[PDB]
Amino acid sequence: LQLQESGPGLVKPSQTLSLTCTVSGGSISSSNWWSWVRQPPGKGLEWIGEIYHSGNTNYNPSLKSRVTVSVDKSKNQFSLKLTSVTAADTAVYYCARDVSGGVNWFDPWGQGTLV
Amino acid sequence: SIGIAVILVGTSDEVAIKDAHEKDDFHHLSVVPRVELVAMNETDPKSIITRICDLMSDRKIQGVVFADDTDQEAIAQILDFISAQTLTPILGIHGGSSMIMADKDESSMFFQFGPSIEQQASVMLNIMEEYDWYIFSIVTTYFPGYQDFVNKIRSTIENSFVGWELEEVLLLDMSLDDGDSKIQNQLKKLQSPIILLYCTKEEATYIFEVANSVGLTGYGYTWIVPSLVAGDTDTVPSEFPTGLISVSYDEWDYGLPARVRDGIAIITTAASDMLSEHSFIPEPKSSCYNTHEKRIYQSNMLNRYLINVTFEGRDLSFSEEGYQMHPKLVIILLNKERKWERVGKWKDKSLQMKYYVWPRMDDHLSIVTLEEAPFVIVESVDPLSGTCMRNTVPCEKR
Amino acid sequence: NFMLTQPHSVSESPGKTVTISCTRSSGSIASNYVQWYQQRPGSAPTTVIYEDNQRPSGVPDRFSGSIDSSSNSASLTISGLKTEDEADYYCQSYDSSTVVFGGGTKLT
Amino acid sequence: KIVNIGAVLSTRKHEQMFREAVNQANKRHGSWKIQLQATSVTHKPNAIQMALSVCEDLISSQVYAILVSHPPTPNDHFTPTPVSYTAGFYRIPVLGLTTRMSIYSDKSIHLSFLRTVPPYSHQSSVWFEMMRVYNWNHIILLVSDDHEGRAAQKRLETLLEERESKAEKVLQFDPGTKNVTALLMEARELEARVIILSASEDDAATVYRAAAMLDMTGSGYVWLVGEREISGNALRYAPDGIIGLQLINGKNESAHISDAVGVVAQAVHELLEKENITDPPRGCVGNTNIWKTGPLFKRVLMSSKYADGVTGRVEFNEDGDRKFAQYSIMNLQNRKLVQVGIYNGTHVIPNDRKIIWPGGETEKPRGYQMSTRLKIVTIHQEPFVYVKPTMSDGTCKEEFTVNGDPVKKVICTGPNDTSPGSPRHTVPQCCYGFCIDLLIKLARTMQFTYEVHLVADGKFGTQERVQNSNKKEWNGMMGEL
Amino acid sequence: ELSTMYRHMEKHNYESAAEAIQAVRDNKLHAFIWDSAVLEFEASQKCDLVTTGELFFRSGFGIGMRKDSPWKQQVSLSILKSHENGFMEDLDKTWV
Secondary structure, three states: OOOEEOOOOOOOOOOOOOOOEOOOOOOOOOOOOEEEEEEEOOOOHHHHEOOOOOOEEEEEEOOOOOOEEEEEEEOOOEEEEEOOOOOOOEEEEEEEOOOOOOOOOOOOOOOOOOO | OOEEEEEEEEOOHHHHHHHHHOOOOOOOOOOEEEEEEOOOOOOHHHHHHHHHHHHHHHHOEEEEEEEOOOOOOOOOHHHHHHHHHHHOOOEEEEEEOOOOOOOOOOOOEEEOOOOOOOOOHHHHHHHHHHOOOOHHHHHOOOOHHHHHHHHHHHHHHHOOOOOOOEEOOOOOOOOOOOHHHHHHHHHHOOOEEEEEEEOOOOOHHHHHHHHHHHHHOOOOOOEHHHHHHOOOOOOOOOOOOOOEOOOOOOOOOOOOOHHHHHHHHHHHHHHHHOOOOOOOOOOOOOOOOOOOOOOOOOOOOOOOOOEEHHHHHEEEEEOOOOOOOOOEEEHHHHHHHHEEEEEEEOOOOEEOOOOOOOHHHHHOOOOOOOOEHEOOOOOOOOOOOOOOOOOOOOOOOO | OOOOOOOOOOOOOOOOOOOEEEOOOOOOOOOOEEEEEOOOOOOOOOEEEOOEOOOOOOOOOEEEEEEEEOOOHHHHHHEOOOOOOOOEEEEOOOOOOOOOOOOOOOOO | OOOOEEEEEOHHHHHHHHHEEEHHHHHHOOOOOOOOOOEEOOOOHHHHHHHHHHHHHHOOOEEEEEEEEEOOOOOOOOOOOOHHHHHHHHOOOEEEEOOOOOOOHHHOOOOOOOOOOOHHHOHHHHHHHHHHOOOOOOOOOOOOHHHHHHHHHHHHHHHHOOOOOOOOEOOOOOOOOOOHHHHHHHHHOOEEEEEEEEOOOHHHHHHHHHHHHHHOOOOOEEEEOOOHHOOOOOOOOOOOOEOOEEOOOOOOHHHHHHHHHHHHHHHHHHHHHOOOOOOOOOOOOOOOOHHHEEEEHHHHHHHOOOOOOOOOOEOOOOOEEOOOOEEOEEEOOOOEEEEOOOEOOEEEEOOOOOOOOOOOOOOOOOOOOOOEEEEEEEEOOOEOOOEEEEOOOOOOOOOOOOHHHOOOOEEEOOOOOOOOOOOOOEEOEEEEEHHHHHHHHHHHOOOOOOEEEEEOOOOOOOOOEOOOOOOOOOOOHHHHO | OHHHHHHHHHEEEEEOHHHHHHOOOOOOOOOOOOHHHHHHHHHHHOOOOOOOOOOOOOOOOOOOOOOOOOOOHHHHHHHHHHHOHHHHHHHHHHHH
């Protein structure tokens, strides 16, 4: 199993970001959720959202109506389409997959973007 | 050195009670208890807790006995409350204490001296089968225990050879007004030589008034009532239809000093047996108020030693819900003058009675017969029950 | 949600045992528990302990963790300090609506 | 005339909210010399302090009705009972706010007590409706042995008996135990895959751990829990996909207080327009008589249909419990709860979210696994089912009928002699007869396998009365089905 | 209408059919009220025992099972098929 970070990458403000992550060694048709943890430089961590391959999503109450994460069954890839991105929320975005089990155990982590 | 307190509200002769109590020299238990006698006229709930906890804080007492004389049917709730809160075992003897209630909590240390609600139904059916009445009907109102009365009645009547014909088991209640005409119509659909009722005092008077308005007292049907209705003697609302069977605990033959004596004996014997068996005498309660959590331990083992007492060759064994299991119920009847008279005595299913044949206060004629040929066959009464089987008539050979 | 505080200014001499603590600001941390992530400088964070008792499949046994259930803080203990210790350590818990991440700590 | 209503609360802010609500209430409806004020008091640890304080409050003024609310704490059903016990002797109505325990529903224990929220043993209607919606017909109860669960089990039994379809089995485990694995082994594979759980928090956690250790939380099982075992420490161990219930406004006490104030204001205004009224007695030490302000007040309070307010339609049944409540069917996914539906009291309308059934996947499991293995009980009879002890090795000896056929035999596992009373041992025999070959033909046609064992008691079976009990149970072979 | 008969039977009732038949041949009893097929078979095996009277309470046999089960229709159809075909006639001619 391996998660490969990808995406076009933009730095322009007042636009909509679109990054997609590829997975190698595993299949998204599993029981494992997919996380989209974001990393602000020089700071800690804050959770963003999770996506299940069935189609339902789980977001954060703070940024509820601003982040959408979807998956592509045919192309074996999910994407993030954060909209109304400002100039004060730049950060490096990480792709992580957790195990269902009965816990949240985000591991192993992906390479990570640098947007 | 076990402290036991006694509370009086009946305004009786406390000197005689003290004299009876001090005449105890049972040199078989290292108990040396103390007796405290206090008097009051307070029926309000508020003073009860204050005074009982003041007595508890007076000098390290561990058990209390309540002696009431009124007809209040609500004190038992506060007594259960105090028993549940304060771990001191408590038992009442006279008055509202004998009034039996629905059920205590999981670990309530309250006990009563009156008969349960299951001895009375058995005594009622015993007297019914003893006087050859057989046909009867049951009426009742909502009360804490009515769901057991009918169940026990049906269970007993179904497991016998003799012929019971219970019918008209209507459950009319006077809780809802504005429509008592419906109550009248529902009661109008009944006819039977015997009726049973289960309703305390006020509802009994109400149904007696409405029945007399309809009219069935002399040419009608006799009534049989539980102890929770008549209970105390003397007082009578004058609506009692001149004749009643009112099985109840005896009052003029059993003395309050004797009840106090055996209560004290039970408590002391239980304490002595526990001390001899475990030597783990519990500490007294901490205080009346300001007691957030002072439960040192759940020392509830006294219940396993208190429900089995053998004193002076007398059986006194309470039950899980609080019973007597061997009471001395007597049967009382109201004559044409308003006062109660003794007619019998109940003792371990031996219903000894004084009136051999019912004296009806004309379509009642004797019928002579002789036993010979396949026309009149004389048999022997069943030795088990006391009366013989169905499809037969009770000829009384001299 | 709530916040987590950690003593990010702890660094002892080599060859010694140290303990790090992650504190829960609001609520009682006794039903939902915490796991620790170590992030080397110039790579991705890696888990070092989950369930607060059992380490992942393959790791030194020097690191350990425990909780007190009194100060609402979870303590992770590392013994035998060496060169493989300079990394960013983070605590992450969760209530039953979101995910909460701690401030983080590192030792030199 | 001036009539006031008192209350006991848990915080000073709630007292100010009560004062504001009563001030808003009295400035409406009529003003025929009517003025009502609110008297409040905080909470104290011990119950006898509550009793004395509440009777002193009764001494302060003739309180027509008292409002009580359970402070935020564990269940602790001992907190609200002193008020009910004290006010019961005076027979004055008492209004409850947040106490959801089902013990208070008993008329005998509490003759005068009204509740504003449905009790715990009242969500069985939701389970019945959900079973009807998702076409589930077989369920396995797991109610704990206590006074709380008996009401729920009897209500569910009656509701199922309406449709002439009884519950497949009802289990009972003692509260506060430490090893319940035996019951779970017994009830793991009976016929059904729908588990309905209702117990305390610690017992729920123990059951969850035991079930997780038995690998029963995998795909093919549907859990349906109550309300208590979804919050607290029950989320430490819980399989994903459980479907719990939650009250819509069980914590926002302000709306409940406002609605209670309004309904009692309407009730007292309606009552005051009549004749033959008295007042409750002043002082918890002077009078010891039943207040005439009694059953008529409660009767007129029950029929108090309210149009529309902050919580919805308010209607009281003949049980002292609020009717027509709203429930939020919700599901747990990845340790995060989310809403899935709404229960309006008539039916349940699904939302725009897809449930995640236990063990992953989204297929709405049928919840019924058929077992192609039956246990068949027979009894000894002369021409129908013979019994011959086997020979030393263990296999039955061969026999031949006059026309020359190998009579078929099967091996029974019944006790020997007359009864297993003194010797408690069973020796395997093998039985043949007129019914055994018919059973063989049935098994051949039916495509299943069988296993026959005799009956221990040896009687055909009749309804016998239990030992000093009001429940009738069967016996013998009839009782083994 | 049969109270006396029950009250007279309840005194001495045997615990199993096998013991009662053995007791009848020893003249410890004078009658025995049991099923029809079993007694009809018994009368053929032994000699001194004979069957009299006429059948009353004519209710057949059956295969009991719980109220809710998926086998009911198929089991009833299989039994009816075995009756109509003629299998039970062969079974009776060999065992009874």
